[PDB]
C-alpha cells in the first residue's frame, strides 16, 4: 500500500520515472523522505515535483515541548536509579545551548554523558560531564 523511500535525494533522476510509474500504475502511495536537498532534487524534476507535493516538515521541537522531551529521555531511554536530577533550568540551558533542538544531538549528548559518568564510577550524570560534551560538540 505504501512505499517509503528514505533518503530519497540519493536516487538518480532517471529512476524518478520508475517511481512515478509505480505510483502511476499500481496505485501505491510513494512517500519520499529526505533532507531539504530532496526538494531541490525534485524541483529539477518536472512531474516528480507535481506528483509529490503534499508534504510534512519535521518540527525543530524547541520550547516547552523540548523541555518535556528532555525529561522523557531521562526516564524512558536513560533508565537510571532516580537521581532527582529532573533536568533543571541549568541542565536545560546547557542542552538548549548544545543540541539546538535536534533529537539526534539530544540523544548523542545524553548517551555520551551517561556512558562517561558510568565509566568513571559516577552513579548519576554530573554538570561536569555535561559541560564536557557541550564543549566537544561546539
Amino acid at each position: 500500500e505504501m512505499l517509503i523511500i528514505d533518503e530519497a535525494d540519493r536516487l538518480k533522476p532517471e529512476t524518478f520515472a520508475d517511481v512515478r510509474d509505480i505510483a502511476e500504475d499500481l496505485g501505491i502511495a510513494v512517500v519520499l523522505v529526505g533532507t531539504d536537498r530532496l526538494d531541490a532534487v525534485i524541483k529539477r524534476d518536472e512531474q516528480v515535483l507535481e506528483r509529490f507535493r503534499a508534504h510534512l516538515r519535521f518540527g525543530k521541537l524547541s520550547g516547552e515541548d523540548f523541555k518535556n522531551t528532555v525529561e522523557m529521555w531521562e526516564q524512558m531511554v536513560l533508565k537510571l536509579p532516580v537521581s532527582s536530577n529532573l533536568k533543571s533550568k541549568e541542565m536545560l540551558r546547557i542542552l538548549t545551548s548544545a543540541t539546538e533542538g535536534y533529537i539526534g544531538r539530544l540523544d548523542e549528548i545524553l548517551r555520551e554523558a551517561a556512558i562517561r559518568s558510568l565509566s568513571r564510577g559516577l552513579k548519576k550524570i554530573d554538570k561536569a560531564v555535561l559541560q564536557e560534551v557541550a564543549k566537544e560538540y561546539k
Partner: peptide, 8 residues
C-alpha cells in the same frame, strides 16, 4: 537563479 528556476 535557483530560487526562480529550481533545476531548469
Amino acid at each position: 537563479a535557483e530560487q526562480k528556476f529550481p533545476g531548469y
